[PDB]
Design a protein around this nucleic acid. Structure first.
Lengths: 78, 84, 48, 52
DNA sequence: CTTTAAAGCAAACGGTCCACTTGTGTTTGG
DNA sequence: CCAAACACAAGTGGACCGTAAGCTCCTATTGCTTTAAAG
RNA sequence: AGCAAUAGGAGCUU
């Protein structure tokens, strides 16, 4: 499901001026990195299964999704 | 009114297993509550065994009231029921 | 193994229902076999 | 993941209904609540109940 | 401008029992 | 004695309730998010 | 002189 779409054509207590306004975002690539650990300080470093086992952590990788928001307006992101 | 006269008593003349068990339990509890003992106590100290000796010698002072299904009852002293 | 595992539930249900059906039945001092309502099931237990 | 990511996209829609009304540029890094996929995957894998 | 408290909000097969449908019978009245 | 309309009789479809006993351990969750008010 | 609940899962003996 690669697209979301908002819309409003007209009649919002204006002076009869109508514009078609689509707001839209495009999902891009997925980026998969090695499992990392973030401390309450905010410092980061590599995470290994034994550390996740000892400190009752979850052994997981961050998933990033590129989003490129576009708009088209016809009168009638990291 | 609901009691039955000693002549028309039509139940068994024999002490049943349940009557014997409950009578022995009750007598044992009684003797264990520092009740007087009717038999001659020679060797035994367990209240249940004393109760068994009293039951065999027909010297347990209790009465079984045997209820009939219609609510009436018959009364039998333990000493007049026959123990096997 | 499946038979042993599966029939035991039906058997336990059957035995529970039989016990509940027959739980209130006792031989009385007049020899009759009556339930809790006093109704006669057999006039003499086992007929002997 | 399909269930939880459709949840996330519904959240994105439910945010873009309000924020766009303000008529402002938004950087989308406050539009994604990343905790949805994480909490869902973790809940399912930690309990075994496969679903929301 | 930030924190705490309170209120509101989502998308397996069998059988006893109940009366509506289908059907049969009456017995007034000519 | 016979015509008839409504008094009176079943056959039939589809509702609910329940499914052995006892025992052990471990593991996770116990409401959450958004809006409004006060300092 | 005071050691939560509810669930799910895996097991024991028939």
């Amino acid at each position: 499901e690669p697209r979301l779409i908002l819309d409003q054509p007209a009649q919002h207590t204006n002076e009869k001026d109508n514009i078609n306004k689509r707001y839209e975002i495009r999902f891009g690539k997925i980026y998969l990195s090695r499992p990392t650990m973030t401390e309450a300080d905010g410092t980061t470093h590599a995470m290994f299964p034994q550390e996740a086992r000892l400190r009752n952590l979850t052994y997981s990788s961050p998933v990033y999704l590129d989003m490129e928001k576009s708009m088209f307006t016809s009168i009638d992101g990291n | 009114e609901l009691a039955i006269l000693k002549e028309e008593r039509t139940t068994t003349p024999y002490l049943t297993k349940y009557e014997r068990a409950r009578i022995l339990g009750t007598r044992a509890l009684q003797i264990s509550m520092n009740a007087p003992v009717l038999v001659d106590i020679e060797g035994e100290t367990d209240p249940l065994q004393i109760a068994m000796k009293e039951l065999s010698q027909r010297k347990i002072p209790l009465v079984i009231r045997r209820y009939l299904p219609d609510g009436s009852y018959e009364d039998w002293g333990c000493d007049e029921l026959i123990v096997d | 193994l499946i038979d042993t595992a599966v029939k035991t539930a039906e058997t336990g249900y059957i035995q529970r229902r039989l016990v509940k059906a027959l739980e209130d039945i006792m031989v009385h001092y007049d020899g009759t076999t009556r339930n809790s309502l006093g109704d006669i099931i057999q006039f003499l237990y086992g007929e002997d | 993941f399909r269930i939880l990511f459709r949840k996330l996209t519904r959240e994105i829609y439910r945010y873009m209904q309000r924020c766009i009304e303000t008529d402002r540029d938004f950087n989308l890094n406050l539009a994604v609540k990343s905790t949805t996929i994480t909490s869902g995957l973790k809940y399912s894998l930690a309990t075994g109940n496969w679903g929301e």
